[PDB]
């Protein structure tokens, strides 16, 4: 799955769309 926002991603590992991977997953 793409990574939830709290749940932290790393480049290698997709946000969701509409969030953006930074240190954690961060919604627009």
Known sequence: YCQK???TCD???P???G???R???KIN
Request: charged residues 20%.
């Open 5 to 7: 926002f709290l749940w």
């Open 19 to 21: 969030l953006v991977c």
């Open 23 to 25: 240190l954690w997953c």
């Open 11 to 13: 480049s290698e590992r």
């Open 15 to 17: 946000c969701c769309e």
